[PDB]
Each structure stands twice: as C-alpha cells, then as structure tokens.
Ligand binder design. Structure first.
Ligand SMILES: NC(=O)C1=CN([C@@H]2O[C@H](COP(=O)(O)OP(=O)(O)OC[C@H]3O[C@@H](n4cnc5c(N)ncnc54)[C@H](O)[C@@H]3O)[C@@H](O)[C@H]2O)C=CC1
Ligand SMILES: Cc1cc2nc3c(=O)[nH]c(=O)nc-3n(C[C@H](O)[C@H](O)[C@H](O)COP(=O)(O)O)c2cc1C
Ligand code: SF4
Ligand code: FES
Lengths: 62, 433, 217
C-alpha cells in the first residue's frame, strides 16, 4: 500500500476570495505562494466565417 | 366583380405552362412562337426595382413548398455591391415524393426557365445563375443544356444577353442522388463540393450564400413564371386565387386515382373538384376515398371528412392542419393499409437524413423502428402517445426542415387514424398472447 | 431496411491505391471545361461533377479514382471520400452493365411497385441487392425518382421506363439482353404526364407572343 507520514497530505481549504485565503495562512503562520486567477479570454465567434468568400477561415468539411 | 368564391375553372388562355404535356416544340423556335423570350430587353431595361415591384404586386409565393412571399425575398438582394459577385440559384432538385412539376417544366419548357433566370438575376442584380438539377434527371438536364446552348447562340444570354447591356451566365450543375440537397443551404454546400449538409440560419443566403457570396435560391416553378408575370403584370397574376393565395399552380395528382397526371389549375380550387375533374376521381368512386396527402410526403394527411370541402391553397390547408406543401396530391382509397404508407414515408425520411444534427439523425431512425413495429402490431397503446412526444421533440429542434417533414406525417396518422393502430395492436396481441 | 454497404474501405487486389485509373484526354478536356464554370480559388466545387465523370468512364469508383480526382483538384483525399460515401449515385463497388433501379416509395408503391419488383426478380433470378452472374444486371430499390405520376417506374442507366406492368418490365429486360436499347418513357400509350385519356386541359392552340402584355411595355 501507499504509506505516508505527512498529516497534512489531504487537507484542502476553500475560500471565497484570495484575500481570505491569504489572511488565514498569515494568521496560521504558514508560508504561502499565491497565483492570480486565470480566466479564458473573450473570443469572437462567427458561424458565417465558416463560409468565407475569400478568407482562410472557410471550412473544408462540415 | 371582385372577391370570387368559386375558384378552379380557368381556360388555357391563362395558363403559363402551355407546353406542360410536351405536345409542342420543346426547343427555342417553339418557345419563341409560344410567347417565350418576348420583350426581354424591355423588361431588363425597366430595371430591378420595376421587376421587383411586379413580383410584389402579384403576391407570388414560393412554389418550392414553404410559400414565402417571392417579392420580399428577392428584394433582400437589392443592396449595393460590396465587392462580391451575386448569384441566383435555381432549385431543380425535386426530391419530394409525389412531386413531378419541375421535371416537366425542365424537360418541356426549358426556355421559360432560362428567361426566368435572366429576369430574376436582373431583379436581384445577380451575375450568373446556377441551376442545380437532380442527378437522376439526366435527359432533363441535357434538354436544359441544349436550350441554354441555343439561347447563347441567339444572343439571349451571355455577354449583353440582348440589346440590353447586361451580362448574365447560366450554369447547370447536377446533383448525385440526395434528397436533402433540395434544401437551399444543403444545395449551396453541394454546389461547393461538400456533403449536402444544411447550414444554420442566420446567415441567410442573401448575406452569405454560394462561395460565400450573396445568393438567392428559387424554385424552378417560381423562376419560370417570373417573366410571364412581368409581361402580363402583377395585377393579372393576382386576379387568380383567394387573397394571399394568388396565381396558378401545378398539381401532381397520383396514387389511387383513375388518371394520375399533372395539371395547371387556379390556386384556390377545391380538392374534390381537382381530383374528380382532371384525375378522373378515385378508383371505386369518391366514397371509396380513405385519405389524401395534399402536398407531398412532408405534409400531414387528411381524411375524407376534410377532403370533401377543403380548398387547395396555403391558408385553407393550414386551417385543415396539413399545409399545401408542393401541391402534390397523393390519394389513398379504402383498399390500402394507411399505416404501411406512413411507415414507408418514414423509411424514406430515415434513408434521406443527412445525419448532421442529433434530433433528426437519431429520432427519425427511432421513429422508423417504432413505425415498423406499429405496422405489425407489436406495440402497446401506451406507445402511441409516446411516439407523439418523440415527434414533438424532433420538430423545431433540428437545423433543417427535414425533421419537420419526418415528424408531421406521423402526427397526422396519429391524429386521424389512432383507432386503426389500436385495433391492429389488439389483433396482434390476440393471435400472439 | 439497413443500408448493407460498408462505409470503410479495405484494400483488395482489385481495389487498392495502385489500381490503374487515369482519365482519357477527352475526359481531361471535359474536366477543364467543368473547372472553368466555378470562380477562381473555388476549384473544389468541381468535386461533384468530375467524380461523376470518373464513374462515367470506369463504371464505378475505385479508391484510385478518388485519389486521382483529389490530386487533380488539389483537394484533400478525405474530402473526396466524404463526397463519394455521402451521395448514393456513386458506385464504390462494381455494378452490372445495366443498373435497374425500381422506385418503392409510397406513391410508387400504391400503384403496385411490388409486382414489378417480383417480376424483375423472377425474370433475372436475382434479389434486390445482387448482380446477375453474367455481370449484365444489378437490381436495387430506390426512393422517389420524381416520376410518381408515371408509377410504377424504373430507372436504367439514365433512362426512365414508366407506367410499368409485369409483362412490360420483362420485355424491356428481353430487349436489353438481346443487344438492343428500349425507348424510354411511359409504356401505356401515354408518352407524357398527361391524363390517361381525354387530355382534360391544354387543348386550345397556343397563344401568340405578346398576347397578354400589359400597357407601357
Ligand atoms: N419542391 C420539393 O421537391 C420539396 C419541397 N419541400 C418543401 O420545403 C418547405 C420547407 O423549406 P424551408 O426553407 O425550410 O422553409 P422556410 O420558411 O424556412 O424558408 C423558405 C424560403 O424562405 C427564405 N426565408 C425564410 N425566412 C427568411 C428571412 N427571415 N430572411 C430571408 N429569407 C428567408 C428562406 O431563405 C427560403 O428561401 C417545406 O414546406 C417543404 O414542403 C420539401 C422537400 C422537397
Ligand atoms: C429536406 C428539404 C428538401 C427540399 N427540396 C426542395 C426541392 O427539391 N426543390 C425545391 O424547390 N425546394 C426544396 N426545398 C425547400 C427549399 O427551401 C426551397 O426551394 C427554398 O426555400 C426556395 O424555394 P422557393 O422558391 O419556393 O421560395 C426543400 C426543403 C427541405 C427542408
Ligand atoms: S434535420 Fe435531418 S436533414 Fe436536416 S440538417 Fe438535421 S439531420 Fe440533416
Ligand atoms: S414514388 Fe416512385 S417516382 Fe415518386
């Protein structure tokens, strides 16, 4: 079996905002690394572009 | 006096398709003496606005089956040029079971279609006309090409097309056995060398069509009458049929009739008069009639109770819960298996789905299996309502209107012939237990 | 019922990428004429006709024919494979010299299309998917051919034969076997889409040009 000696190997905490997480870690005395939230960028979609008269976007299949 | 009430007796002086039966020269010389290619230059010189107005005044509705008003739809390409060429596509697929009007127009009056292409392209500002014809219509396509050749030689199309100053080309592209390619967007895709799979709308073809250019798709019947409406005028065409149901119409009467045929008739003719006059009535008498599909397989069937008093136009048949469709009357007498006919239509639709979208691709095959079990009686009554709901899920949830045409005949059969289904199930249970 | 034809390709000694296929020079002239109709930069639009042209020279479409069309039009071969498997008029297997297609849809079935199908089967000794051992005929059933008024009807190598009867269908087979070609059209003294007797309309002499023209034109 898989053995461990780490008592915190399973602990996961959930926070509303990064500030709450940072405050919790600071008051508990843990060194922390924060990563900014990554969101998908807004993309311009257009169905008609699939059938461009002169553009490269035209679909070869459908 | 205006507002006629008894439509359905018009003489040959008011029929557009005078060579419907091919009893006269199908070539140009014939057409020319029959009134074809007359004052084309004058019509072209009147301009697109004048041409568009004539279509609008006539009230002409699309003869391909949907009945969308033709003038408004053609006016969608009246925009100024944006650098892209403009095209007119003629829908000559004619895949609807029970329908043979476009075949006759193509084989026996091709110059009417060529002139209609020229006038429609002038109205839309189009550059050339692509005529997408059924692949199985080899001889019809060859006659069409001969007609286009003799029109090119006589200077009726091509460069300047007339003493007009307008350049117009007419191309014939043949399909390869696909009923779905009758749909306008699927037709456009098949012209561009792809599978005949319909597009989503928007965009509409007037914005992004064939080769990505503004396009207008028109039925062969709609296109052919375009020049006669222009010379005769919009007011004359309208003077036939009820309000919002103007003009004449080709009807294909087939099935259990004494003389199956095709005939031009006024729009709002009653169904009974049309069947008993031109088709020779139902074999076994009018009281032998069981059901009628008034507009090709895509329309729900109606029983004899409705058939005796319904008019053959868009709004009248909509009020009868069926629809005019392609004006392809299929008659079934009291001697046929009404469930088997609908099952065969559903099998046709199962074999004709393109498979692109989920509701059609899965549910039409599902409905085919259910209907094949219904024919034998394998099912239970609780499935009939179930089947109804399956159709409802399919209808209005698909890209293409083939799903509607698959779900409507089943709804018609269930709406009007449920007791036959239930007694078939009871019989199968009785001799099987 | 189910289609029966497979939509995968497995190489065979008679159908592999090295099966000999090439267009005739006349077919190359026709290909150039076909290509010209479409706008420049949209050459693919010729996949549908040119593929058909290949089948009109070879009889069917071997995988090498699809590869040749794809290379000639500079289209990826999978696009030509899609086109070939989508459309039902393309023959991805060899067929007989005469391809009999009988319509069995509802308007055509209501006028006793099964009688025609059984007559063909008993005349040829083959079923609705098979090819005669002489490799002359192949019988299949098809959906609506657009000749419903003339039902029952059959389509043979671009010729419609309509208003069929069991005796009538058999004779056409006899005429096709003995090395003759039969005249297409109705087989009941109709030769049109007209009513079978009487000609209820279109009996008046056709009107002269400009008869109904409106004022100011
Ligand atoms: N002639 C034949 O052999 C066959 C005919 N049909 C008939 O086709 C009918 C269904 O065809 P659909 O195109 O799906 O009906 P639809 O109502 O969606 O459109 C029909 C025509 O009107 C145009 N249109 C509609 N709304 C428009 C808008 N807002 N802007 C611009 N253009 C617009 C469409 O582009 C199309 O050309 C059915 O009623 C069926 O009876 C079906 C199969 C075969
Ligand atoms: C599955 C399907 C098949 C169709 N087949 C045809 C056809 O063969 N011929 C035709 O004119 N219209 C056919 N239509 C309807 C076309 O959308 C119609 O022709 C197009 O909208 C323009 O027709 P119109 O001139 O009557 O307005 C079909 C529609 C669907 C959904
Ligand atoms: S409804 Fe049927 S034919 Fe139309 S796009 Fe969907 S799957 Fe294809
Ligand atoms: S149903 Fe047979 S040709 Fe139409």
């Amino acid at each position: 079996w898989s053995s461990t000696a780490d008592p915190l190997s399973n602990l996961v905490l959930t926070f509303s905002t990064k500030e709450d997480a940072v405050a919790f870690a600071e008051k508990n005395g843990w060194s922390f690394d924060v990563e900014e939230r990554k969101v998908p960028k807004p993309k311009s979609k257009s169905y008609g572009a699939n059938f461009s008269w002169n553009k490269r976007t035209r679909v070869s299949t459908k | 006096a205006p507002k006629k009430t008894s439509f359905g007796s018009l003489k040959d002086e008011d029929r557009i398709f005078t060579n419907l039966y091919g009893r006269h020269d199908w070539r140009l010389k014939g057409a020319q003496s029959r009134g074809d290619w007359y004052k084309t230059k004058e019509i072209l010189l009147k301009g697109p606005d004048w041409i568009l107005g004539e279509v609008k005044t006539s009230g002409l509705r699309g003869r391909g089956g949907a009945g969308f008003p033709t003038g408004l739809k053609w006016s969608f390409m009246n925009k100024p040029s944006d650098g892209r060429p403009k095209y007119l596509v003629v829908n000559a697929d004619e895949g609807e079971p029970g329908t043979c009007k476009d075949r006759e127009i193509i084989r026996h009056d091709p110059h009417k279609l060529v002139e209609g292409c020229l006038v429609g392209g002038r109205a839309m500002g189009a550059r050339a006309a692509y005529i997408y014809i059924r692949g199985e219509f080899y001889n019809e396509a060859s006659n069409l090409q001969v007609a286009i050749r003799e029109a090119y030689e006589a200077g009726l199309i091509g460069k300047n097309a007339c003493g007009s100053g307008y350049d117009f080309d007419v191309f014939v592209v043949r399909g390869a056995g696909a009923y779905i390619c009758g749909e306008e967007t699927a037709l456009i895709e098949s012209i561009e060398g792809k599978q005949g799979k319909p597009r989503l709308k928007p965009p509409f073809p007037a914005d992004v069509g064939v080769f990505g250019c503004p396009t207008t798709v028109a039925n062969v019947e709609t296109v052919a009458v375009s020049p006669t409406i222009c010379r005769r005028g919009g007011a004359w065409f309208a003077s036939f049929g009820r309000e919002r149901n103007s003009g004449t119409k080709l009807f294909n009467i087939s099935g259990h009739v004494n003389h199956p045929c095709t005939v031009e008739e006024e729009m709002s003719v009653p169904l009974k008069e049309l069947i008993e006059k031109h088709a020779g009535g139902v074999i076994g008498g009018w009281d032998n009639l069981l059901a009628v599909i008034p507009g090709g397989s895509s329309t729900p069937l109606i029983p004899k109770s409705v058939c005796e008093t319904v008019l053959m136009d868009f709004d009248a048949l909509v009020q009868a819960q069926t629809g005019l469709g392609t004006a392809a009357v299929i008659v079934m007498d009291r001697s046929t298996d009404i469930v088997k006919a609908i099952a065969r239509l559903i099998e046709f639709y199962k074999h004709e789905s393109c498979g692109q979208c989920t509701p059609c691709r899965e549910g039409v095959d599902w409905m085919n299996k259910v209907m094949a079990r219904f024919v034998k009686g394998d099912a239970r009554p609780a499935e009939i309502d179930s089947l109804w709901e399956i159709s409802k899920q399919i209808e209005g949830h698909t890209i293409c209107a083939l799903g509607d045409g698959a779900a409507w005949p089943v709804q018609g059969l269930i709406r009007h012939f449920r007791p036959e289904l239930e007694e078939r199930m009871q019989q199968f249970a009785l001799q099987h237990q | 019922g189910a289609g029966g034809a497979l939509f995968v390709h497995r190489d065979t000694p008679e159908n592999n990428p090295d099966t000999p296929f090439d267009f005739t020079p006349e077919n190359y002239k026709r290909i150039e004429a076909i290509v010209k109709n479409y706008p420049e930069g949209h050459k693919a639009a010729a996949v549908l006709p040119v593929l058909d042209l290949a089948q009109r020279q070879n009889g069917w479409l071997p995988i090498s024919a699809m590869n040749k069309v794809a290379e000639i039009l500079q289209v990826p071969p999978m696009r030509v494979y899609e086109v070939a498997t989508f459309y039902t008029m393309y023959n991805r297997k060899p067929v007989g010299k005469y391809h009999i297609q009988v319509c069995t849809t509802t308007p055509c079935m209501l006028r006793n299309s099964d009688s025609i199908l059984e007559a063909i089967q008993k005349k040829l000794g083959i079923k609705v998917g098979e090819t005669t051992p002489d490799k002359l005929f192949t019988l299949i059933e098809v959906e609506c051919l657009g000749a419903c008024v003339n039902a029952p009807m059959v389509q043979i190598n671009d010729n419609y034969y309509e208003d069929l009867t069991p005796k009538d269908i058999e004779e056409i087979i006899d005429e096709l076997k003995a090395g003759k070609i039969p005249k297409p059209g109705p087989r009941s003294g109709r030769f049109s889409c007209e009513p079978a007797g009487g000609l209820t309309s279109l009996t008046e002499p056709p009107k002269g040009p400009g008869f109904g023209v409106q004022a100011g034109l």
